Design a protein around this nucleic acid. Structure first.
Ligand SMILES: [Cl-]
Ligand SMILES: [Cl-]
Ligand SMILES: [Cl-]
Ligand SMILES: [Mg+2]
Ligand SMILES: [Mg+2]
Ligand SMILES: [Mg+2]
Ligand SMILES: [Mg+2]
Ligand SMILES: [Mg+2]
Ligand SMILES: [Mg+2]
Ligand SMILES: [Mg+2]
Ligand SMILES: [Mg+2]
Ligand SMILES: [Mg+2]
Ligand SMILES: [Mg+2]
Ligand SMILES: [Mg+2]
Ligand SMILES: [Mg+2]
Ligand code: NA
Ligand code: NA
Ligand code: NA
Ligand code: NA
Ligand code: NA
Ligand code: NA
Ligand code: NA
Ligand code: NA
Ligand code: NA
Ligand code: NA
Ligand code: NA
Ligand code: NA
Ligand code: NA
Ligand code: NA
Ligand code: NA
Ligand code: NA
Ligand code: NA
Ligand code: NA
Ligand SMILES: [Sr+2]
Ligand SMILES: [Sr+2]
Ligand SMILES: [Sr+2]
Ligand SMILES: [Sr+2]
Ligand SMILES: [Sr+2]
Ligand SMILES: [Sr+2]
Ligand SMILES: [Sr+2]
Ligand SMILES: [Sr+2]
Ligand SMILES: [Sr+2]
Ligand SMILES: [Sr+2]
Ligand SMILES: [Sr+2]
Ligand SMILES: [Sr+2]
Ligand SMILES: [Sr+2]
Ligand SMILES: [Sr+2]
Ligand SMILES: [Sr+2]
Ligand SMILES: [Sr+2]
Ligand SMILES: [Sr+2]
Lengths: 119, 115, 246, 145
RNA sequence: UAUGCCAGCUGGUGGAUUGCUCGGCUCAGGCGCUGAUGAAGGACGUGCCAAGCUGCGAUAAGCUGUGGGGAGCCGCACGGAGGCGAAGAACCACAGAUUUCCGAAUGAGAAUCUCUAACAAUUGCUUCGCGCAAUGAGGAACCCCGAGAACUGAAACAUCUCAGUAUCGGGAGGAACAGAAAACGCAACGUGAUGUCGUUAGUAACCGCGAGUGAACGCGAUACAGCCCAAACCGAAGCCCUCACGGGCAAUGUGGUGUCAGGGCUACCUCUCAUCAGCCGACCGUCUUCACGAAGUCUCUUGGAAUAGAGCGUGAUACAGGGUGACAACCCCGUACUGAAGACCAGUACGCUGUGCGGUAGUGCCAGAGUAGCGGGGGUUGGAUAUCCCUCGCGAAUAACGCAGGCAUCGACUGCGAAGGCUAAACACAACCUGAGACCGAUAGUGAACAAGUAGUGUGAACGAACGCUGCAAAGUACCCUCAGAAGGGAGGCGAAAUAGAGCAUGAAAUCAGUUGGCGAUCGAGCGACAGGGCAUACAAGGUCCCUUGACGAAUGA
RNA sequence: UGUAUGGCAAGUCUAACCGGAGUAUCCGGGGAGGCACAGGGAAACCGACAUGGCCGCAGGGCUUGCCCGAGGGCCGCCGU
């Protein structure tokens, strides 16, 4: 649908498996060349570099990925609460870039390398 | 007020001649054209044949239509002619636009107004 | 008159006779009438629910309690136009005919007149198009219909000194008002119309502001968007010929 | 600006006293109410008049005046050119869905014509014959008797 | 100066306004039945903690399989504890398991429980045994068959009209109904089943001949399709149940033949590719879903944040739409192109098997009765003598006869065979799926953007609201003081901003507190307009104004 | 039923619908049918001035008052 209300609606109500595409980030130049893909679903093992927020320029390992809220926790990308406890400042994966992947999963590595499919 | 830019210009030109040159018909025709379309002339050939004479331009402050027979070798000047009117007129004479008549005869001389 | 054909490199390659239609006296009022018709005819019927505000057994108490004779239900006024939650006195109606008729002869004349407005460089520039050229419309060979890449059509246009019009239409405007909430957030200038003969140029269609069409069915709108005559167009040798009997 | 467009602020919208534009009383009744009483003026009088013959017993003739034929003789080059000769049945539009073709005699006949039709008026003949012409009645035209 | 008036300022109150849209409204395409194999609906349950909603059903936010999917997950709902998932969970598609009680509700009774084997009730078949079956109830409207108002209009009113409308009873389907001429009647040397659309036409016709009411034949289109009995002549050659055995039906006729291109019978010519039964069984298209899918996240400046400005660069069969800390073709989802699946079209079309089309001559063998038709009384219709129907009475012929062609009878002419039956497609609606919009934008639009048919009212039928917005990120305010205090307050911390601090964007008016200017306790009331004085006034967006004298100098005029 | 504007003109317009396509727009096709092209008469039935006279506005002409004079006005005559 070209209608905005329907667009937003389908994104906010997409089922869990369809929410994977809502946590995808662009790949670095070397990775794009190595896997023939422009982007990939950020995983909790991948290393990422912040390209946009107040944390732009920072590098870190992805500590968490929430499909429900479609955001990720990157290491050291935090906010200091009033009590002093540092807590994660969620990031939209579109403001982030993948520099290193976590290929421990046979299935993930397979999808990344296959030409007919994407990950 | 008219909406056709052409008719609008034709009237402006009819006036410019009536004023500049000595033509009194062009201003007379301009005044009729400025009037409501329903009052404009819808003249068939049978009327031109009845009241027109050679060497006297027929001036129609409106449109000429194709009903009837025209035998006289006359020059008809009008805002417009139906496809058939123009065709029938040229077989025995000459159908001319008002815009042409104003240029050829800005003094508006030797001309008969027909409606 | 005569129109100069151009090869896919931007160089002259002979010339043909510009058809008589391009000599049709420009009639912006008729063109505007035609475009108003086309635009109105694609408008959808709408109207509020015929029973909105009428779903209540509300009744007026009449005289006696120092209150206006307004129908009420459970203490709250209802139904009537002046009451909150009441019906709309004269709302939009689905039954309404939102279409406009146009005599074929009148519309066919508007097409020809619009076509003719294309052959006037001053009109085209007046309409707003950006280009450095004298001869217009821009006539090109039939091999144009075999182009596949958009990037290639760009080069040909830069060679024809007509690409500036695309840089003009390369600016999306974010409209003022709630149209945005209905999917009408953006709009952009109308640039070049590409008229072909066999099929609409898939290669030129994505160009900013461009519109592709075919000789047999090119209409008043693509010829004069918004009813404004004189659009920067580019015909095809065969399109140019086929358009003559329209 | 239209008349309607200038109404906001007028209160009465041209109706005069606000006691005017109420129901059908302001019209003197609904539709043609009172056509023989208070609004009898400019109404056709009450009553029955005449009779109608059944639709399928009624004949409808396709007619043309000599003037129409005579004015198009040259333009009718697709037809016979004798010493002209024209079968009216092939000239009149809507001749099929009509019981017969009749030539009426209005206008002048400035040519020698040989017309063939189902019927002719006294005037049609006089005009055609008096101009060195002739009138040929069709086989269907052999009704006159 | 008290009480107080006018205007403003600071802060409230209030929630208008502006911006925003998870909801509506409307149009369009597709698709369309469910139920005794117990539906739809309802009740009550079901979670670690669980009130609402959603889901589910004692296997209770779930169990199994296959496929997809993928490193996460444990609904709405961001908690605490804990758990699940590479033994591939979540999540999605298809299929299956489970599936309490009431409910058509069916063993009997009952306000969702109870009492002692149940198709209750009505039917068909029948081994005459509930053994095998059927019906019931639901569904947004649409459809078909029945019952059938009144306000109203007629400027009153009765016929007429509103209207065969509202409403009521009964019933089917995915569509219904209709339908292969006892037709039409541009009267013909003509048309050729039926719906529907455009037109014919506000024509004909009706009507206190008032107001009003109102077709059809035909024509142009859409879609096209044509058949089966009864009987003649045959006469058990037949059908149903059962694996079989065997049983049931059937001479009151199962089955063959046959159906106006009449047929049968007798005698003949030739032939079939009609029809009917049955087998096989789509392409394409359409709707929906899915796979794949190009190109910048480069420099400087501003900013809390670049999607901004300037500069440089790229894709495009893709410059639709959305998301992302501000305006994004190139950051993310998508979009073009190409491809796949399901559904519908459709068990249809094409193909095939079987059967056999047809013609001549003779033959008064057959061809639907309370019928055709007439009369009495009503309703209905445009139907007028000439609509369709109901009711009461009467009542025919037999194809060599009969009916129709808008009054009756007789004759001619033309058409056509009633009183048996079936029938695809083209059309209605909108539950359901998807798409769309010069529609509305939170007092609007649905009653319902929120707990919405919710809260709440009524014995009941029924009636029925209001409530949208912190922030880029919860960073949702640690510590300290005060206090009866998890309140509130002070100080303090976060953030671009807390006058963004929780019904937390903006924050109008009415109006309230404090306060500034003017007036003010000897004085008069449409609150002002126009003149002219006092007092008051940061900048900006206005820059003029005063007096001597002089020039000009209308009417008037010492 | 008027009016203003616009198209075409003794004609004019398509309706349902069909094809195309960029697929509600739009291009092409469709004239069925409507209105106009003759009227009068209940009906049967019959069927008309493409101009014969005079006046004359605007306009044109001439040797400057005299001519030609569309439209208009008054009559004739024509159909029923
Ligand atoms: Cl005329
Ligand atoms: Cl009659
Ligand atoms: Cl017929
Ligand atoms: Mg790959
Ligand atoms: Mg409302
Ligand atoms: Mg606005
Ligand atoms: Mg019971
Ligand atoms: Mg009344
Ligand atoms: Mg009366
Ligand atoms: Mg009626
Ligand atoms: Mg009929
Ligand atoms: Mg049989
Ligand atoms: Mg009645
Ligand atoms: Mg509301
Ligand atoms: Mg606020
Ligand atoms: Na209600
Ligand atoms: Na009051
Ligand atoms: Na409409
Ligand atoms: Na009033
Ligand atoms: Na006919
Ligand atoms: Na469906
Ligand atoms: Na709960
Ligand atoms: Na279930
Ligand atoms: Na049963
Ligand atoms: Na039994
Ligand atoms: Na009345
Ligand atoms: Na009364
Ligand atoms: Na009556
Ligand atoms: Na982003
Ligand atoms: Na009777
Ligand atoms: Na008949
Ligand atoms: Na609200
Ligand atoms: Na026609
Ligand atoms: Sr969730
Ligand atoms: Sr959530
Ligand atoms: Sr009283
Ligand atoms: Sr008035
Ligand atoms: Sr009223
Ligand atoms: Sr009277
Ligand atoms: Sr016709
Ligand atoms: Sr047929
Ligand atoms: Sr019979
Ligand atoms: Sr008779
Ligand atoms: Sr409110
Ligand atoms: Sr009560
Ligand atoms: Sr503070
Ligand atoms: Sr005092
Ligand atoms: Sr003086
Ligand atoms: Sr036409
Ligand atoms: Sr005259």
């Amino acid at each position: 649908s070209k209608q905005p209300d329907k667009q937003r609606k389908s994104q906010r109500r997409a089922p869990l498996h369809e929410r994977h595409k809502q946590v995808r980030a662009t790949l670095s130049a070397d990775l794009r060349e190595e896997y023939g893909q422009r982007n990939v679903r950020v995983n909790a093992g991948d290393t990422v570099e912040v390209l946009r927020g107040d944390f732009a320029g920072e590098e870190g390992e992805v500590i968490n990925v929430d499909l429900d809220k479609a955001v990720i926790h990157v290491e050291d990308v935090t906010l200091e609460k009033t009590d002093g406890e540092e807590v994660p400042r969620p990031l939209d994966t579109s403001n982030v870039r993948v520099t290193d992947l976590d290929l421990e999963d046979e299935k993930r590595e397979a999808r990344l390398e296959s030409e007919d499919d994407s990950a | 007020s008219k909406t056709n830019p052409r008719l609008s210009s034709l009237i402006a030109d009819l006036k410019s001649a009536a004023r500049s040159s000595g033509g009194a018909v062009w201003g007379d025709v301009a005044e009729r054209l400025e009037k409501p379309r329903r009052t404009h002339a819808e003249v068939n050939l049978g009327r031109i044949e009845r009241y027109a004479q050679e060497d006297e331009t027929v001036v129609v402050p409106g449109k000429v239509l194709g009903s009837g027979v025209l035998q006289k070798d006359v020059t008809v000047a009008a805002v417009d002619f139906s496809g058939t009117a123009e065709t029938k007129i040229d077989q025995v004479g000459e159908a001319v636009s008002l815009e042409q008549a104003i240029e050829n005869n800005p003094e508006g001389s030797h001309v008969r107004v027909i409606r | 008159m005569q129109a100069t054909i151009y090869d896919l490199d931007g160089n002259t390659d002979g010339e043909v006779d510009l058809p008589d239609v391009f000599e049709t006296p420009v009639r912006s009022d008729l063109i505007g009438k035609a475009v108003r018709a086309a635009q109105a005819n694609r408008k959808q019927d709408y109207g509020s629910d015929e029973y909105a505000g009428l779903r209540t057994p509300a009744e007026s108490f009449g005289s006696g309690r120092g209150q206006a004779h307004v129908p009420k239900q459970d203490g709250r006024a209802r139904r009537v136009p002046q009451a909150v939650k009441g019906r709309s006195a004269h709302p939009p109606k689905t039954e309404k005919d939102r279409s406009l008729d146009l005599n074929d002869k009148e519309r066919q004349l508007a097409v020809r007149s619009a076509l003719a407005a294309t052959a006037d460089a001053d009109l085209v520039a007046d309409r707003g198009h950006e280009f450095d050229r004298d001869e217009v419309p821009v006539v090109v060979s039939d091999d144009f219909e075999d182009l596949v890449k958009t990037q290639e059509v760009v080069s040909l246009l830069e060679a024809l000194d007509v690409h500036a019009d695309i840089d003009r239409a390369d600016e999306t405007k974010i409209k003022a008002g709630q149209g945005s909430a209905r999917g009408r957030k953006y709009r952009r200038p109308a640039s070049i119309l590409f008229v072909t003969s066999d099929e609409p140029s898939t290669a030129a269609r994505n160009l900013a502001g461009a519109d592709v069409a075919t000789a047999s069915e090119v209409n008043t709108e693509d010829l004069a968007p918004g009813g404004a005559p004189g659009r920067l167009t580019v015909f095809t040798e065969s399109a140019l010929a086929e358009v003559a009997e329209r | 600006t239209s008349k309607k467009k200038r109404q906001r602020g007028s209160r009465t919208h041209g109706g005069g006293s606000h006691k005017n534009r109420r129901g059908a009383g302001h019209r003197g009744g609904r539709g043609d109410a009172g056509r023989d009483k208070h609004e009898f003026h400019n109404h056709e009088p009450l009553g029955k008049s005449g009779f109608k013959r059944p639709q399928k017993v009624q004949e409808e003739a396709a007619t043309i005046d000599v003037r129409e034929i005579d004015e198009n003789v040259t333009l009718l080059a697709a037809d016979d050119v004798a010493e002209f000769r024209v079968d009216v049945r092939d000239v009149v539009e809507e001749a099929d869905d009509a019981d017969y073709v009749k030539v009426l005699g209005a206008g002048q006949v400035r040519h020698e014509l040989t017309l063939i039709a189902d019927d002719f008026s006294e005037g049609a003949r006089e005009k055609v014959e008096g101009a060195g012409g002739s009138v040929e009645l069709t086989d269907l035209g052999e009704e006159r008797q």
